[PDB]
């Protein structure tokens, strides 16, 4: 369970609480939240005070639970306001408490997993992490676990690493004190004079030189940073994603005017004039790169791998790069519908589109209707243009409002923040974690009714009122999906088609396809009937569900009548002896004929049970009339 | 092209929109929380073109569908990591694109999108005024669960447990009984025959409608069926973006289960509240909130029913002139009235067919034909006639 602005914890202090560790002051709490190993993490003051309040509440609850155990306003061991507590050594209470422990363990695991995903998604709760206390093994493990796994392209990894190094070197002055340790790796990064060798030959190269790609690529990325004012990882990702596409003149055109190419080349040349001295003491797109297997195997690129990890786990700032690169928004994410229509303004005429969809077999769109269609299409375009501006601003405002807090089930959703985060989660693992949390909550709620009991006199008065099968039991025909499947499949024609009417599924591929389609239609009709029965009492929902039933039944009956006609007409008998011997006993044709007419499911009077209604046809139609 | 892009996005372990607050993309609750394309159509008028859930039963159906497909998505993700390893080993853009399109064709991702099949000009307009099939192909962010249900066995459980079904049956019976007694109270007041009398007195001012000289031609023209008779519906003004989003959000907000709703609300508040809790304390708070919500809902339903039907004594229990002192008002509901009508219906009734000793009462078709039907031959004959459309005998 996680919202857009959740604070899922990442530390496990329940072990310390059960062993007796108590943080007394702020220094003690910080010593608790310190990680004595690799992958150090820096937090925010709000997150820290939230964690401190949580720790104090945990301590108060633990001591209250200890007080309740000693007893063995309202302590956790107290009963509900209208319940009584069973003896401690009883089977019901022991099972309930075991379920309580299981549910709480599941909830803690879900919270820890959510916190881990939040930490590795680079949310504002954890501003940064550092890998200073990490070895080469730890660096390679991080690389494999995050970058290689989440990257489809190997060359994009090299591009990202070089861009991270370039942007870090360019923005070196504006960094806190804790960010100084990465500059050692930045300097230790080794490049190869690949272009030097052909000039000398006019091509032998060292393997260690081949492992590192080149230095002209780094100069190209520095040129890119100078051109596009790259200052954070989100914009680095955007400009690295949409620079190989042959539209960087317009697609990557930044909202601020980019610097002149001559100025950028002068800056690059000055940097090279300093770099040559240091070593002694518009560029084209970069070419091929050595494999990432070499990257993570060799230690020549080890500082490059370290700075790549640093850039991947840092430089993530909560801001949208689309305010700086408005054109790149359409390439990075799906464009707005209004913008899609504006781009396909040359869609000819809506009347022409309708004509090409309908085809030549039909009358060609009377002129007055075509004119009305064109006028309506133009009006729709005008409405889209008018509302495009209002929709963008209003949509952002509604997400961050009091309504989202009041009803977080619908308005609040993770991965719905205004800023862009290239390392956003797939929202499938988070959904699974939410499912585990809610099932644990259901188990805990089930166990809380087993832990406690009602009064003996209350249960005695309850038992004085016996339950009779006549009128005090749930009907055996309660609406369930298998209940509605069984009634449909027990129909003589449906059963005939399923068993022997259709060709055998295993032997015939087309028979298997027909069986799949028949099952799909049967399931659709049964699901529609089940929904109609569930929402039978609600008038409008009953009407719309009955429309769904009509559609599904019509589809199923069309398929069934087609199959019945085909199996009746498939009299593929080479000789008359085969026909006579088929007619001698009950074959498929004669069994199909004996059944009689197939009653259409559309013309039926089922209601809330799958059984024909006892009311008159007029009343049934009035009930199942389409909504007005 | 679009299929290859969708398959690449599905391969990627990141959000296709990167968590960005994008227009016309809805983080559907029933579809887990993955974004889905929900453009705000203006041909229908400020209407979001996305399914609007009606019932928490549909919500649970969707949730259990995701539970059922959880097995498929794991193996699919293993296959996706194998394909991603193959792409990483690949170094040619053409080879990558060919592999992507082959995998998309194998996974049937292009079948995730659904195109409006229509031939009628109005139906075509309602979909092609804005986002046409081209826009459907373009903004077609696929889902791993959608791909899983593209090829997977169909579940039958629907995910509703015994307690949920018991509650649903109880509330269905309660709503049906309350509606029936409200209608019987209305009939007892007699406003139904007042409606009939109002219809009778309204018939005075009516006049014979004009069915046309050629009645078939006139009826067809009214239906808009003949060539050139099609009239487009009026262009309704689109709603505000806030209202258009709010209706869709409330559709799922009123269909969420109580446990999930309270859990989400308490987890959202836990960051802001001055006394945050972790673990067992939060679990206890959730349980207490759920119990309080249940008992308050029961109390509110009972109180609204009592207010509507005027239940309970009208003031002091022990009056000088007897404990039963009811003041009846014209055209108002009362517990005494309800009890009296029930008494008139079934004072000393042992069976529904108690007064069926005479054929005239016995053969009445007011309540239904259940008592008239007595053999399976007659039942089958009646159902066959009803299915064939002819009048029931």
């Amino acid at each position: 369970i996680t919202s857009r602005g959740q604070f899922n914890p990442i530390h496990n202090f329940s072990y310390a609480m059960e062993r007796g560790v108590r943080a007394r002051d702020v220094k003690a709490f910080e010593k608790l939240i310190t990680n004595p190993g690799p992958l150090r993490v820096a937090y925010t003051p709000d997150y820290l005070d939230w964690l401190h309040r949580c720790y104090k509440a945990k301590g108060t609850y633990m001591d209250a639970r200890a007080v309740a155990e000693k007893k063995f306003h309202n302590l956790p061991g107290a009963p509900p306001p209208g319940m009584f507590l069973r003896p401690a050594h009883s089977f019901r209470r022991l099972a309930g408490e075991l379920k309580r422990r299981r549910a709480q363990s599941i909830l803690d695991e879900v919270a820890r997993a959510q916190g881990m995903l939040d930490l590795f998604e680079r949310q504002p709760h954890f501003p940064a992490i550092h890998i200073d206390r990490c070895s080469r093994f730890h660096l390679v493990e991080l690389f494999k676990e995050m970058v290689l796994e989440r990257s489809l392209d190997s060359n994009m990894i090299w591009e990202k690493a070089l861009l991270y190094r370039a942007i870090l070197s360019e923005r070196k002055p504006s960094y806190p004190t804790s960010f100084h340790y990465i500059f050692t790796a930045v300097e230790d990064t080794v490049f190869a004079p690949t272009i030097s060798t052909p000039m000398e030959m006019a091509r032998s190269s060292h393997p260690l030189a081949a492992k590192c790609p080149t230095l002209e690529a780094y100069y190209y990325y520095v040129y890119l940073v100078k051109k596009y004012y790259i200052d954070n990882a989100v914009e680095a990702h955007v400009v690295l994603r949409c620079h190989r596409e042959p539209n960087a003149a317009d697609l990557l055109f930044s909202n601020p005017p980019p610097k002149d190419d001559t100025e950028i080349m002068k800056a690059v040349e000055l940097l090279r004039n300093a770099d040559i001295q240091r070593g002694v003491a518009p560029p084209v797109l970069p070419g091929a790169y050595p494999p990432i297997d070499m990257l993570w195997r060799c230690e020549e690129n080890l500082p490059l791998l370290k700075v790549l990890l640093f850039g991947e786990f840092n430089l993530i700032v909560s801001e949208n790069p689309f305010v700086k690169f408005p054109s790149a928004h359409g390439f990075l994410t799906r464009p707005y519908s209004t913008d899609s229509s504006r781009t396909l303004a040359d869609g000819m005429s809506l009347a022409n589109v309708m004509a090409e969809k309908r085809g030549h077999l039909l009358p060609s769109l009377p002129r007055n209707t075509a004119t009305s269609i064109d006028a309506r299409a133009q009006d729709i375009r005008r409405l889209q243009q008018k509302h495009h501006r209002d929709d963008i601003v209003s949509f952002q405002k509604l997400l961050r409002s009091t309504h989202a807090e009041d009803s977080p089930s619908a308005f609040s959703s993770y991965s719905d923040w205004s800023y862009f985060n290239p390392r956003a989660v797939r929202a499938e693992e988070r959904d699974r974690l939410t499912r585990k949390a809610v099932e644990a909550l259901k188990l805990y709620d089930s166990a809380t009714n087993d832990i406690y009991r009602h009064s003996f006199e209350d249960v005695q008065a309850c038992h004085t009122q016996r339950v009779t099968e006549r009128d005090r039991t749930m009907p055996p025909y309660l609406p369930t999906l298998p209940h509605f499947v069984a009634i449909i499949k027990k129909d003589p024609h449906i059963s005939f088609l399923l068993h022997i009417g259709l060709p055998d599924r295993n032997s015939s591929e087309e028979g298997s396809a027909k069986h799949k389609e028949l099952e799909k239609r049967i399931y659709y009709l049964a699901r529609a009937l089940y929904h109609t029965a569930l929402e039978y009492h609600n008038e409008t929902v009953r009407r719309v569900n009955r429309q769904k039933v009509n559609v599904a039944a019509s589809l199923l009956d069309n398929f069934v009548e087609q199959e019945w006609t085909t199996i009746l007409r498939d009299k593929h008998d080479v000789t008359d002896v085969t026909k006579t011997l088929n007619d001698t006993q009950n074959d498929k044709k004669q069994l199909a004929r004996r059944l009689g007419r197939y009653m259409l499911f559309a013309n039926r009077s089922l209601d809330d049970t799958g059984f024909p209604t006892d009311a008159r046809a007029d009343d049934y139609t009035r009930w199942m009339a389409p909504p007005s | 092209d679009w299929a290859s892009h969708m398959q690449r996005e599905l391969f990627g372990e990141v959000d296709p929109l990167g968590g960005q607050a994008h227009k016309d993309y809805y983080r559907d609750v029933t579809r887990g929380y993955s974004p889905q394309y929900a453009p705000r159509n203006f041909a229908n008028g400020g209407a979001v073109a996305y399914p609007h859930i009606q019932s928490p039963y549909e919500y649970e159906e969707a949730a259990h569908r995701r539970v059922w497909l959880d097995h498929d998505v794991d193996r699919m993700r293993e296959e996706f990591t194998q394909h991603r390893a193959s792409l990483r080993s690949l170094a040619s853009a053409q080879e990558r694109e060919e592999l992507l399109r082959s995998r998309a064709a194998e996974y049937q991702v292009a079948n995730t999108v659904h195109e409006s099949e229509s031939v009628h000009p109005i139906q075509q307009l309602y979909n092609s005024g804005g986002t046409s099939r081209s826009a459907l192909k373009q903004q077609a962010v696929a889902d791993r669960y959608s791909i899983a249900e593209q090829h997977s066995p169909l579940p039958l459980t629907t995910g509703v447990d015994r307690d949920a079904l018991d509650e649903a049956q109880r509330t269905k019976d309660r709503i049906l009984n309350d509606s029936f007694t409200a209608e019987n109270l209305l009939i007892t007041h007699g406003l139904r025959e007042k409606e009939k009398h109002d219809f009778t007195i309204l018939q005075r001012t009516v006049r014979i409608p004009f069915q046309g000289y050629d009645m078939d031609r006139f009826l067809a023209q009214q239906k808009g069926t003949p060539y050139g008779a099609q009239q487009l519906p009026p262009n309704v003004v689109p709603s505000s973006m806030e209202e258009a989003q709010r209706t869709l959000r409330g559709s799922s907000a009123t269909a969420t289960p109580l446990v999930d709703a309270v859990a989400q609300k308490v987890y959202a508040r836990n960051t802001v509240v001055d006394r945050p809790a972790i673990g067992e304390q939060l679990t206890e708070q959730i349980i207490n909130i759920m119990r309080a919500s249940r008992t308050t809902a029961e109390q509110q339903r009972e109180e609204e029913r009592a207010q509507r039907f005027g239940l309970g004594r009208q003031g002091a229990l022990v009056q000088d002139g007897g404990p039963d002192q009811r003041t009846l008002k014209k055209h108002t509901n009362d517990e005494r009235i309800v009890d009296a009508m029930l008494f008139q219906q079934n004072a000393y009734r042992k069976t529904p067919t108690d007064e069926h000793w005479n054929p005239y009462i016995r053969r009445s078709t007011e309540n239904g034909v259940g008592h008239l039907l007595q053999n399976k031959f007659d039942i089958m004959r009646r159902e066959d006639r009803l299915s064939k459309g002819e009048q029931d005998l």
Binding site: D618, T621 | F199
Partner: peptide, 30 residues
């Protein structure tokens, strides 16, 4: 506001539409 799921006498109806008039003027015989 005619109620739903209501059994009406064959000689009359709710009156919602033409197919369900207030008073049925058509016989149910042959």
């Amino acid at each position: 506001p005619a109620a739903d799921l209501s059994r009406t006498k064959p000689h009359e109806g709710t009156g919602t539409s033409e197919r369900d008039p207030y008073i049925r003027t058509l016989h149910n015989q042959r």
